[PDB]
Design a protein around this nucleic acid. Structure first.
Lengths: 117, 108, 189, 100
RNA sequence: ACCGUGAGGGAAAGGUGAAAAGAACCCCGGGAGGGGAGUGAAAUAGAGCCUGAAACCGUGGGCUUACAAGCAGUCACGGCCCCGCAAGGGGUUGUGGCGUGCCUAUUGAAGCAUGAGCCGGCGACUCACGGUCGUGGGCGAGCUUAAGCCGUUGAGGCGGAG
RNA sequence: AGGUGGAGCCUGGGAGUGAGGGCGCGAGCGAUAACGUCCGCGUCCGAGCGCGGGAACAACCGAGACCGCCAGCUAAGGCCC
RNA sequence: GGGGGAUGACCCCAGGCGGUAGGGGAGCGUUCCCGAUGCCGAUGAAGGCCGACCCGCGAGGCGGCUGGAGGUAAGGGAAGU
């Protein structure tokens, strides 16, 4: 009934370590805060995990404005007019357009403005 | 190209370190006067580990002069765990940190 | 049923309701178990040492903290306590029971008394070539009262007796034979 | 060759470059299959029209493969004595943009 | 060995190889130690010389660094560098974007409350006899002490006070 | 009666804390003084009731965190930067 | 929980799922005893060193380099985990 756990623990650590890129001076191999720093980073990522998709909701937000206004108006106008829509409703891709295909964008831009006034 | 060395070398790894960090990657003969007429200890030593170096080559690793030190380094190891005044109660030992001494000697 | 008689070309004996029956794994092992059990050994770690020396666990209000365990080689913590009651007396009924149904498993092989006579471990190389295979692999000696002489020695020893030859016995996977007097243990059954 | 319809989720702006697509384990199985995908973003060869003008025709793409979670780890942790770990999910079966 | 006047305490420390065949000779050098040759399956197996990990000190290389804040960092986008799981990813980060470490005890904690300098190994709900419910199952009258006998393996089987 | 729907009751094994505060309200004390304490009615937090807001701020307004980075409507709260 | 499950699994919707003491269920490697008609390895036991297949996971497998000799159990048992 010997338990020389050995070889085992050591491993684990390696484990984490890996989890251990080459982050900040130390932890680097910090078989502790090593481990730690982790936990941290983690959860972080997480919250980041759901985060992003937001950072986007906005990103487009501007690149959007960049145009929405360009022509001559804001995203409480557009929007309103847009939803006046009926067989066509989208936002994301819209942007990355106005920039990709000017005409395209430019377009709706109209059909829009209108829908509105 | 060939190389010189020697462990169980009593001395300030560190100090040593400056040693080369000079004559470092440079013409043989050349630095061969750096350490000849530089200062701080090690030198002496340092010099030495350049002669059995220049030697070894030409002799068994072969084109003289055209040579130099593509690279040079030193490492510490074996200590000398040394005992001193018992905290006037508990022991306080230092360590004459042994000293390795490798160093390249390749031909131009 | 298919109570095959040895000597092969000779007769055939009946299957005794007993063996017949179904099966009872649970008990199965169990029988087992209550085997190794009453049959292992024991051990532990020093009583003297592991609580052997004096000890000056040190005052305190100094820079420390404190003849017991938790600083090296010494102590234990709850080790081999030889005083480790090892037995496990299954239970009569229990036991017997096992072997039974047990054997039952065996059935799934008839040793003519007449054999209780053959006199050389090369007469086994014989009554061998009689009926070999892999199950023989198993094998499993056993006469009926007083073992199958020489029959006892070879590269598969083991000579129970129409009395004394249980699961521990062959029960394991295994495959064997019993001299009538053997099925004299059945009576034991 | 560049259209932008929208599936059980926009996931759009394509034409031919098969676009890793959200699950759909009922029509999919259809290996290199064909199926309709309502439009609403008619952008082809510098000519556009309502995504409501569209909502009439559309396209279709061949049920290509079944991407297997493109790695992605989720260290679920906090100082608050709560840890745990689960790897990516979101796959998906791939399929080219059959345009028309 | 070692601290203790004493009674007493009371450690650490094993491993080359198949066997020495254990490194004649030549080299720089006062030497140790380093360069060749030779043993050799291998000596980065080489004399405290099997495996010989981490921490920690080096030598080169990629990337990166002087109007800049935080251990962290992680989400976005960009350039350099390599594509033995190539039209996808590696590594490093310039920016910006959201971010108060980690453990015990705490009404409540980033903590300026304590715990820890760093790494590796030891190190903490166990065993026995009772009793107690639950469950896996053998008979309903169910069940066995101690012992007697049998015992490569050593094979259990009889014992009926309770 | 019961629209509900999923709590309820008895028998039995295994537990933990046995000292909390914060807010609104109705009372006690208190200089109607205290992030004071003391009882009550609801909530609140519990080392994660983690996220939004109020700059920052357990905690008060809204919210119940199984998981899905380049979807969509709103809450409270906001939209000159 | 419920509608039929063939052993899987598949379909609906109800229905949540934040959680420390602490309660119930399920799994993982660790050194050993089986070898329940089990044995791999000098063209490497094992540990080591490094990785963009398998799993929610704790681990697996598998391929490249190292190193001198072991031990693995398809399944149940045990414990100085």
């Amino acid at each position: 009934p010997r338990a020389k756990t050995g070889i085992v623990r050591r491993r684990r650590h390696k484990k984490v370590l890996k989890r251990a890129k080459g982050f900040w001076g130390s932890r680097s191999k910090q078989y502790r805060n090593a481990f730690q720093t982790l936990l941290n980073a983690a959860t972080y990522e997480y919250r980041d995990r759901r985060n992003k998709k937001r950072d986007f909701r906005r990103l487009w937000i501007q690149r959007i404005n960049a145009g929405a206004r360009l022509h001559g108006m804001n995203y409480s106008t557009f929007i309103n007019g847009l939803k006046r829509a009926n067989i066509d409703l989208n936002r994301k891709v819209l942007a990355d357009i106005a920039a990709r295909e000017p005409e395209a964008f430019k377009a709706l831009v109209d059909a829009s403005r209108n829908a509105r006034q | 190209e060939a190389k010189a060395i020697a462990r169980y070398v009593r001395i300030s790894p560190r100090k040593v370190r400056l040693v080369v960090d000079l004559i470092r990657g440079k013409s043989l003969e050349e630095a061969r006067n750096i350490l000849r007429y530089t200062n701080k200890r090690g030198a002496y030593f340092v010099a030495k580990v350049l002669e059995s170096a220049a030697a070894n080559a030409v002799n068994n690793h072969d084109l003289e002069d055209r040579l130099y030190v593509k690279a040079a380094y030193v490492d510490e190891g074996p200590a000398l765990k040394r005992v001193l005044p018992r905290a006037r109660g508990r022991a306080d030992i230092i360590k004459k940190r042994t000293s390795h001494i490798t160093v390249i000697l390749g031909e131009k | 049923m298919e109570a095959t008689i040895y000597d092969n070309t000779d007769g055939e004996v009946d299957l005794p309701d007993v063996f017949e029956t179904p099966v009872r794994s649970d008990l199965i092992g169990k029988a087992v178990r209550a085997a190794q059990a009453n049959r292992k050994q024991d051990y532990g770690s020093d009583e003297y040492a592991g609580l052997r020396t004096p000890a000056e666990s040190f005052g305190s209000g100094r820079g420390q903290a404190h003849r017991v365990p938790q600083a090296v080689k010494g102590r234990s913590a709850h080790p081999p306590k030889t005083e480790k009651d090892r037995s496990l007396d299954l239970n009569d009924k229990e036991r017997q029971l096992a072997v039974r149904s047990a054997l039952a498993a065996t059935a799934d092989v008839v040793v003519s008394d007449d054999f209780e006579d053959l006199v050389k471990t090369q007469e086994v190389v014989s009554l061998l070539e009689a009926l070999d295979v892999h199950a023989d692999i198993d094998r499993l000696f056993v006469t009926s009262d007083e073992p199958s002489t020489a029959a006892r020695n070879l590269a598969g020893a083991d000579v129970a007796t129409a009395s004394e030859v249980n699961t521990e016995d062959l029960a394991p996977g295994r495959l064997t034979v019993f001299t009538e007097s053997a099925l004299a243990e059945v009576a034991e059954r | 060759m560049f259209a932008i319809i929208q599936t059980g989720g926009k996931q759009y702006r394509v034409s031919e470059g098969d676009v890793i697509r959200v699950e759909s384990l009922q029509g999919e199985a259809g290996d290199k299959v064909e199926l309709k995908a309502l439009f609403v973003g008619g952008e082809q060869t510098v000519f556009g029209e309502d995504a409501g003008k569209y909502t009439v025709q559309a396209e279709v793409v061949e049920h290509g493969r079944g991407k297997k979670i493109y790695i992605r780890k989720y260290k679920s942790g906090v100082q608050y004595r709560r840890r745990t770990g689960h790897r990516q999910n979101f796959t998906a079966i791939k399929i080219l943009g059959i345009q028309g």
